[PDB]
Amino acid sequence: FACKTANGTAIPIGGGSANVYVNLAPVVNVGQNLVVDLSTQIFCHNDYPETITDYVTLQRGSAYGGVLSNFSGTVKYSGSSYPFPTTSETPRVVYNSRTDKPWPVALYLTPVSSAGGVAIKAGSLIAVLILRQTNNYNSDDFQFVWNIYANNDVVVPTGGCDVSARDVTVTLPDYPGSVPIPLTVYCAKSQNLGYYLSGTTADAGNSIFTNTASFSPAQGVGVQLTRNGTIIPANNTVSLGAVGTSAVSLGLTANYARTGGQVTAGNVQSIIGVTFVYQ
Amino acid sequence: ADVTITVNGKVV
Amino acid sequence: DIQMTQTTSSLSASLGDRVTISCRASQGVNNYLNWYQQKPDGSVKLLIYYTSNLHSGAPSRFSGSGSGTDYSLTISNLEQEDIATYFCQQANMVPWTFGGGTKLEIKRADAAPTVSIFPPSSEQLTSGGASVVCFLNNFYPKDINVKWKIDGSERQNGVLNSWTDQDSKDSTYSMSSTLTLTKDEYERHNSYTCEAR
Amino acid sequence: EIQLQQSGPERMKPGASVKISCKASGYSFTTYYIHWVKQSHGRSLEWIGYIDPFNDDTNYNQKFKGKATLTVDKSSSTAYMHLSSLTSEDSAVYYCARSYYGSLDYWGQGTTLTVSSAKTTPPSVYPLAPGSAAQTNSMVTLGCLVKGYFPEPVTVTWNSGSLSSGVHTFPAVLQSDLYTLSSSVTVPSSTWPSETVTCNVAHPASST
């Protein structure tokens, strides 16, 4: 039972366990969200088929780890899908020739939020897969673990909907200008969606936000978002209606807002977070 | 705050 | 491969009974074994998966259990809806395999065949062909044996036998037989008659 | 709900190649596998293979791998079954089935494939009458013989259905790739000869 990664790195055997680095391409689907498909990037074979007909199974206890350790889903395995983490030993995959074939596994996630996502960083842990090997012949049984690491930075969605970008930067033209904000929302199934604005407001109406400039800050001027002329205060929901696979622009615009009397030139900055809620 | 927005501006 | 097997091909049950069907696996499987029901219309359905789990929508009177190389399915109280064929399948090791199947019958008072025989019509003998037909109706039990004899001698070629499915109201078996013949041979013999069990 | 709609029955010559389809709906097409199963006319079930409709990985039963082939169209959520170099044995019913937890939890209606060299044909028909006499003077048995049609089905009715309920229509059988069939009725021994007891037969694809 030899193996190697997508980048050609042979996965060591000889120590009880291993570290594996793979490329993650999460995508939102209906009911499930894909995390990683190891059919693309793990290839195993049998260097001495005449002498053995190996089997491999995903022993119970295999689970998400690292930052995903609290999540649950399913695992595609050898022709069928089972719940994940595994409460029981799965059926047996068979390796009986020197020719490589993929490790037919893929990990899914049961949505637990609206939009939302947890940021994976390269060199982090993804999941711990307890594996059990056996054979036709030598009355000989082993177990070994593969720690699954991501070698590329991604964000793993946890809701039924995704957005164009997680971090967005918009450069206001000089006072008193405004700009459109390129944000859009799409959902794999026809869903309702709203959103409310999170940030450190500055005013009594909670509609304007304070400057955060760390260098020669301007004073008396704060940001104020609006959609088609609607002032969208903080901690308030604005509904998108029914959202499907067609991405919907939030309709947000970024403005200046005059707070507290006289003004002084200088930089201006404000960081805003958008949260989505099912409706 | 599953989406974070950075607003950059200046006054002169 | 894994050679699945079911103990009996046909189960002469009766309504209200508690019937149990058991299949064996040529080698162990970690309880990855499923039960399917096929109606006479041909449609197949999943009853129970992973040896004890009731599929979402199946009747709550089906049960399964077993340990590697020994499994069985049970119906607590037969309904008329449950007359079908039942297969078990292992999902442990590719290639997936199915059993031989078991057909679920209804038991009833026995009956003898109502044998008959008809000569070829005038029309058929005009076109060179000839067919002698034997009808055996509403006999019980299923297993019947039929024969053709010409002038005392038996014949076992040119015969097509057809069986009906068990009736739905009376629940008896019926059968047919046809011995196709030609003018050059239908008139080279003298007497025919159909014999049964 | 979950439903697998397949194409209608096929009819191909030997040496042809056919393509069955299975339009899935009611669930995320890419998150589950799809299997194909063959129920030969002995009614035994046999397993062909599976395809993952996300990356199009396939595994084929060693029995068919050189003959079958699975493919998928993600956009329309449709799978396809392709079988080439047909012969007599390929006459069977083929099911597209989902999979979950080691079980085929949903099946399709099935698609009947006929691999026949013969050509469309209205049959010949002969009547049957008792012959000797009314050998049982309580109830007498009459029947009609339908021979040599193509394709299925034929529909036999007696007196537009007046003398049903004593009718035993046997299933059709194939002789030299031409279907032969018979149907039998038994009537009270006051109705016939007293009534016009002759059979009615119809055949699609011939409008007879």
Side-chain angles (χ1 to χ4, degrees):
Chain A
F1 178 72
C3 296
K4 45 219 178 180
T5 59
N7 88 292
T9 312
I11 312 182
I13 277 159
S17 64
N19 300 279
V20 181
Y21 301 81
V22 290
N23 264 332
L24 268 68
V27 72
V28 176
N29 301 344
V30 187
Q32 297 287 262
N33 304 336
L34 176 71
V35 165
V36 56
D37 173 337
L38 313 179
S39 322
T40 297
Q41 44 209 313
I42 308 179
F43 299 74
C44 303
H45 58 290
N46 163 348
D47 314 70
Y48 287 136
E50 308 98 331
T51 65
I52 278 299
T53 325
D54 294 301
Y55 310 116
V56 177
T57 59
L58 194 92
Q59 251 288 359
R60 34 169 285 135
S62 299
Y64 280 136
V67 201
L68 293 172
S69 147
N70 44 97
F71 291 160
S72 69
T74 59
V75 57
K76 270 186 194 184
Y77 193 98
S78 202
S80 201
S81 50
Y82 319 80
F84 190 80
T86 53
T87 58
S88 64
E89 181 167 299
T90 62
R92 308 189 311 193
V93 189
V94 196
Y95 296 93
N96 42 307
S97 187
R98 294 140 209 270
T99 36
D100 310 7
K101 20 182 290 188
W103 200 55
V105 179
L107 309 191
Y108 287 91
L109 182 162
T110 311
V112 201
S113 59
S114 307
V118 305
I120 281 64
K121 297 98 187 172
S124 62
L125 186 74
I126 292 295
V128 196
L129 304 187
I130 315 172
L131 278 69
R132 181 171 166 224
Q133 175 178 347
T134 59
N135 55 68
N136 192 31
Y137 187 101
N138 274 117
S139 303
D140 164 60
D141 178 295
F142 301 139
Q143 299 200 14
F144 42 62
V145 178
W146 290 358
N147 292 84
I148 288 299
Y149 299 94
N151 67 12
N152 83 4
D153 309 81
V154 317
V155 86
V156 159
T158 307
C161 306
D162 225 341
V163 304
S164 53
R166 334 291 300 161
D167 210 271
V168 152
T169 89
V170 297
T171 313
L172 274 160
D174 290 28
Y175 187 78
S178 84
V179 294
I181 313 185
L183 254 165
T184 62
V185 201
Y186 87 87
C187 302
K189 181 230 302 184
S190 180
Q191 298 279 143
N192 290 344
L193 278 184
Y195 64 87
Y196 77 95
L197 292 181
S198 49
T200 89
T201 66
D203 54 286
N206 275 20
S207 65
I208 304 166
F209 301 73
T210 309
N211 182 0
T212 293
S214 191
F215 165 33
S216 190
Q219 299 164 19
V221 175
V223 175
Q224 176 168 260
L225 303 201
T226 67
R227 106 177 282 187
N228 319 97
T230 298
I231 306 104
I232 298 178
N235 292 15
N236 219 313
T237 313
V238 171
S239 190
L240 279 179
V243 178
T245 48
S246 293
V248 175
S249 170
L250 291 286
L252 289 170
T253 309
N255 304 7
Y256 290 62
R258 263 191 41 90
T259 57
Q262 190 141 88
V263 178
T264 290
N267 306 300
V268 175
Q269 197 182 75
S270 303
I271 297 183
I272 272 283
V274 193
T275 326
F276 291 101
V277 287
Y278 269 144
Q279 298 200 310
Chain B
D2 64 275
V3 152
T4 69
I5 307 168
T6 299
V7 179
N8 291 314
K10 165 165 53 60
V11 187
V12 298
Chain C
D1 289 345
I2 273 185
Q3 291 96 250
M4 301 275 308
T5 283
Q6 305 212 230
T7 48
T8 185
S9 308
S10 98
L11 177 63
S12 295
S14 173
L15 218 75
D17 216 339
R18 182 166 185 288
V19 315
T20 188
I21 310 128
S22 54
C23 43
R24 183 169 310 290
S26 72
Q27 61 151 70
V29 311
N30 295 22
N31 299 38
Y32 284 112
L33 193 134
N34 313 280
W35 287 104
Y36 302 106
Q37 174 188 242
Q38 187 173 45
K39 298 286 194 167
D41 304 66
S43 71
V44 192
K45 288 228 180 213
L46 175 82
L47 290 175
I48 279 193
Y49 64 90
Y50 201 36
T51 279
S52 324
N53 315 61
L54 171 143
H55 175 270
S56 147
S60 61
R61 42 183 184 69
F62 285 91
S63 77
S65 63
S67 95
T69 69
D70 184 1
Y71 302 77
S72 323
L73 165 91
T74 307
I75 309 102
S76 65
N77 53 263
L78 283 197
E79 287 205 69
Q80 195 57 21
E81 258 290 275
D82 303 337
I83 283 80
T85 302
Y86 294 92
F87 305 96
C88 69
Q89 174 238 317
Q90 66 87 354
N92 194 44
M93 192 182 59
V94 167
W96 297 10
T97 59
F98 295 82
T102 292
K103 209 173 329 161
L104 205 58
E105 160 173 327
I106 285 182
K107 183 137 196 63
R108 56 149 291 135
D110 320 90
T114 310
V115 173
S116 285
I117 178 152
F118 301 86
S121 64
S122 59
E123 291 165 83
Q124 180 169 22
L125 281 170
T126 300
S127 70
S131 151
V132 194
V133 176
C134 179
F135 293 153
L136 307 92
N137 313 82
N138 295 79
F139 63 88
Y140 187 93
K142 176 169 49 52
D143 312 79
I144 189 154
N145 272 27
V146 175
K147 291 164 162 283
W148 282 92
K149 279 196 172 60
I150 309 180
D151 302 340
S153 185
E154 210 168 296
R155 175 177 178 148
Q156 297 83 0
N157 203 335
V159 86
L160 301 179
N161 294 317
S162 191
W163 303 254
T164 40
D165 214 338
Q166 183 165 81
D167 174 63
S168 315
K169 299 351 198 175
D170 289 345
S171 70
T172 42
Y173 284 82
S174 192
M175 171 177 189
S176 178
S177 188
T178 326
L179 167 66
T180 296
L181 300 167
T182 52
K183 184 174 194 340
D184 72 305
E185 81 164 338
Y186 176 80
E187 287 148 35
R188 89 177 48 142
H189 274 110
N190 312 265
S191 70
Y192 321 69
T193 282
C194 174
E195 173 179 341
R197 182 276 306 135
Chain D
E1 75 297 339
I2 300 110
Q3 24 194 356
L4 275 50
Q5 263 85 40
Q6 313 190 216
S7 62
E10 292 309 345
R11 192 262 290 108
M12 311 294 168
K13 264 275 297 184
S17 320
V18 50
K19 176 177 299 323
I20 307 78
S21 68
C22 171
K23 176 75 183 80
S25 64
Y27 74 97
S28 200
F29 176 63
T30 55
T31 306
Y32 296 88
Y33 284 51
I34 308 294
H35 293 255
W36 286 82
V37 195
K38 170 192 186 191
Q39 185 168 30
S40 182
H41 289 305
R43 303 274 83 64
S44 74
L45 288 169
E46 194 123 24
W47 192 73
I48 296 155
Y50 63 90
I51 184 158
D52 183 318
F54 178 82
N55 89 330
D56 296 26
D57 263 306
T58 62
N59 200 210
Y60 295 147
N61 184 339
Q62 203 44 20
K63 207 181 196 179
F64 306 144
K65 80 192 301 186
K67 205 182 194 291
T69 282
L70 304 186
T71 36
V72 173
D73 158 41
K74 304 182 171 93
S75 68
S76 295
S77 88
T78 303
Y80 304 99
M81 152 76 179
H82 180 90
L83 179 71
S84 61
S85 151
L86 305 172
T87 61
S88 46
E89 313 297 301
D90 298 313
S91 312
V93 188
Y94 298 92
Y95 299 82
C96 66
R98 205 170 83 145
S99 188
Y100 178 76
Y101 220 131
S103 71
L104 300 163
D105 66 327
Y106 294 101
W107 300 56
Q109 62 243 14
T111 287
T112 309
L113 171 73
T114 323
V115 174
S116 173
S117 200
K119 82 177 200 55
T120 308
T121 295
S124 212
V125 50
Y126 310 134
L128 306 162
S132 309
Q135 79 171 31
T136 304
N137 52 259
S138 174
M139 272 266 185
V140 78
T141 183
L142 307 172
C144 272
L145 205 186
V146 169
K147 165 153 207 163
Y149 54 119
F150 195 109
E152 291 146 329
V154 59
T155 302
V156 202
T157 181
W158 294 76
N159 235 334
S160 307
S162 308
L163 284 163
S164 63
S165 312
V167 67
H168 279 282
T169 182
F170 304 91
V173 73
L174 266 196
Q175 173 164 290
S176 48
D177 207 355
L178 242 183
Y179 292 93
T180 323
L181 167 146
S182 49
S183 176
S184 189
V185 85
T186 278
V187 306
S189 203
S190 71
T191 58
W192 174 99
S194 199
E195 289 162 27
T196 55
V197 187
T198 299
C199 57
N200 326 133
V201 282
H203 191 208
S206 34
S207 314
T208 44

